[PDB]
């Protein structure tokens, strides 16, 4: 019976591979050869945000493009006003080690997680005027790598126990559990409609999950190393992935296979974060060489390099309006580029 | 100049937050951070309990020696895989690796673990303090002459006690030989490929010893002295 199961699984994998190979009728490089070059996309450090004491590890833009929330291993969440570089909130953390931060789309809550295995949701609209730990959701048996807000009540988290959980913040229980990954779920990205999302783990795999159904609809295994970053294409029909292999990869959900690989001989380090521009034609990737790269999504050509960092770039995020980008590095500096 | 009243008030609030941040900076740079790693059989729990008598994750333990504040961070609930969450633990003053010297059956896995810590990309700079716990159990096993180290480790048959090493008083030659060979087993790996950016400080400790904190203090003093000798162009 067990041997029959293994052979059937191998046959199903062969069938899926055959279908994927059949679907590949044309390649994007050939399709977009005539598209005009993007040119030299050069960026400048408009603002430098200072005040953190240790390595910045997480960042997240709000619905508005004026507020950032950054997390530091010293044990602080600092909310900065990008337009004026003002620390609106300075929330201490019980656990010094912080690896993920989130900002609710409405802006009424901020999440914080890490090795403590507890997701702390803090309320900034308190009548008392002091930020408080509104909720401390526990249950995960591994460190939290990412957390994103679907709404004020529901928050999705990914832990180091090779699982993800949907938490009703008020009730504080795992409403739905997503399991199947072979390694730590480093990266999470929610779709624009929030009905679907993508999770990339350390087993060189990414999975497409539906929040309601609770199943991994699609699996992608294009990378040769651990996946440390995943982001959603703006349309919602593709996602970019950055892994330890030093190469970014585009995977489209409809065709169910990779659509481009971005790699250069000059880079041999891993990728920390990945994001897209509003149109999706500029893939921004942070690298361990203290440099960030702006590739052309549709043609795979390095459009620019942002080298204004002194340590590992750990966080990367493009505004909702797309006017600027924000990079957080282990040098304790959060810098805005445009 | 162009700023309005509420903008100036927000700026003042930002200055207050920056002042609080500097206040926290003083303590943060004053505090010394340590990463307590050890096997389940290794008596890390015993040392942790000793310190504070002077699905949770990281367990902290703060102690003070000679007015120096030491935070010690223990990783209990993290998954078996270690390659990823070691990154957050760089920039630590020392990695206190606790190894069970009593059980020779699992000492090979302990050596492999120490090698993994030593040759990690992110922990190349940081120093490791090696505490070989349960020295009393080591002596009992060696002098009961029932468990032979040669069975697990072949080379022990050829190894000879180093004359440079100083034997402890009231210690049989067999216990000295066994303990120093187990030390040399780790020291050989530590010295090779280290390149001098990180150093190991093996120490022989027992279960309920009271000198663990002072040994850690001395090791941290040495590590900081070397760090300064490099950062001040003295080497």
């Amino acid at each position, epitope marked *: 019976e067990l041997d029959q199961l293994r052979q059937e699984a191998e046959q199903l994998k062969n069938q899926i591979r055959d279908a994927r190979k059949a679907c590949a009728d044309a390649t994007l490089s050939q399709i977009t050869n005539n598209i005009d070059p993007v040119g030299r996309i050069q960026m400048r450090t408009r603002r430098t945000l200072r005040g953190h004491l240790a390595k910045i590890y997480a960042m997240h833009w709000g619905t508005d493009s004026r507020l950032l929330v950054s997390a530091s291993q010293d044990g602080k969440l600092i909310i900065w006003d990008s337009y004026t570089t003002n620390k609106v909130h300075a929330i201490p953390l019980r656990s010094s080690w912080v690896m993920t931060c989130a900002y609710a789309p409405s802006g009424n809550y901020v999440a914080c997680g890490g090795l403590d295995n507890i997701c702390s949701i803090y309320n900034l609209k308190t009548r008392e005027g002091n930020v408080r730990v509104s909720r401390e959701l526990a249950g995960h048996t591994g460190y939290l790598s990412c957390c994103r807000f679907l709404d004020d009540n529901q928050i999705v988290t990914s832990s180091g126990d090779t699982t993800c959980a949907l938490w009703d913040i008020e009730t504080g229980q795992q409403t739905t559990t997503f399991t199947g990954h072979t390694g730590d779920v480093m990266s999470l990205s929610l779709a624009p409609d929030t009905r679907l999302f993508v999770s990339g783990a350390c087993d060189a795999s990414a999975k497409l999950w539906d929040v309601r159904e609770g199943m991994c609809r699609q699996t992608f295994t294009g990378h040769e190393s651990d996946i440390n970053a995943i982001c959603f294409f703006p349309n919602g029909n593709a996602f970019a992935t950055g892994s330890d292999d030093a190469t970014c990869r585009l995977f489209d959900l409809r065709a169910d296979q990779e659509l481009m690989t971005y790699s250069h001989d000059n880079i041999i380090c891993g990728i920390t974060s990945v994001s897209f521009s509003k149109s999706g034609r500029l893939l921004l990737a942070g690298y361990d060489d203290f440099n960030c790269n702006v590739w052309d999504a549709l043609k795979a050509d390095r459009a620019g390099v942002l080298a204004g960092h002194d340590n590992r770039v750990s966080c990367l995020g493009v505004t909702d309006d797309g006017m600027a980008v924000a990079t957080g590095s282990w040098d304790s500096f959060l810098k805005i580029w445009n | 100049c162009t700023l309005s009243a509420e903008d100036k*008030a*927000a700026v003042e*609030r930002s200055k207050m937050i920056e002042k609080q941040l500097q206040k926290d900076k003083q303590v943060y740079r004053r505090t010394l951070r340590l990463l307590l790693l050890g096997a389940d059989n290794s008596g890390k729990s015993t040392i942790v309990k000793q310190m504070r008598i002077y699905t949770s994750g990281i367990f902290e333990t703060k102690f003070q020696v000679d007015k120096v504040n030491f935070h010690m961070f223990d990783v209990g609930a993290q998954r078996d895989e270690r390659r990823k969450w070691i990154q957050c633990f760089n920039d630590v003053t020392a990695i206190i690796f606790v190894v069970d010297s009593s059980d020779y059956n699992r000492l090979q896995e302990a050596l492999n673990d120490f090698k993994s810590i030593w040759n990690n990309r992110w922990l190349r700079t940081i120093s490791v303090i090696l505490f070989l716990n349960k020295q009393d159990l080591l002596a009992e096993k060696v002098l009961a002459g029932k468990s032979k180290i040669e069975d697990y480790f072949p080379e022990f048959a050829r190894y000879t006690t180093p004359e440079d090493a100083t034997p402890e008083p009231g210690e049989d030659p067999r216990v000295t030989r066994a303990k120093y060979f187990i030390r040399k087993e780790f020291v050989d790996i530590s010295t090779a490929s280290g390149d001098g950016r990180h150093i190991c400080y093996p120490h022989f400790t027992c279960s309920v010893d009271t000198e663990n904190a002072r040994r850690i203090f001395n090791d941290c003093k040495d590590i900081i002295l070397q760090m300064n000798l490099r950062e001040y162009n003295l080497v």
Partner: single-chain antibody
Amino acid sequence: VQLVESGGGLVQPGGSRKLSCSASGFAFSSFGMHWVRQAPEKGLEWVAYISSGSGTIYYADTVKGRFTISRDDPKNTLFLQMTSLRSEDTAMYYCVRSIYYYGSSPFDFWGQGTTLTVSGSADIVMTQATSSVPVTPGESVSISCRSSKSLLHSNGNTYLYWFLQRPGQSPQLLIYRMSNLASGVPDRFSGSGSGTAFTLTISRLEAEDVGVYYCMQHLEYPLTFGAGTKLEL
């Protein structure tokens, strides 16, 4: 959140009395404090302001110098030492709290008020021509005000605050910047404007709406209010 005030009684001209203001239920240190006087059968006026941490302290022109403001954070209390009392100073003094950060709601909580019975320049002038605007329940009401100087700033914010003081009750905040409804305010209330003339509209009138509506500016710290329009049932 409750701010209770005490230390106001019968005083004669030239006396010196201290008002005390005790807060409970919120971070007193983080918030800034303001003193607002309501003279009997008169409008609102701003007395003094102390920032969080005492890094910025301001006083009104009328009481410039004579009155002092000081806060004792460890005891969670605020003081006001009066000097050279005059017959014009008789009024009910309230404590207001204001935290200033992006997306804040300044002048949010007001204190009950201590009665005191004794015995201008380049300051925006706020005018509310309609002294009385009688309306019936269920009908929409409108209140119009103006400013000599434009209340809009390069940052892009209109610094106009709409408050309502009900019969025998302390003032409350309705709109903090010309468009935004304060916490706990019915959605009926709404505010609009252009920079020189502003309107506050109540969609349907109820029995807890009646009162005197005041408009205040915050472009310059000599914060000014209006005569206030009274809505009758």
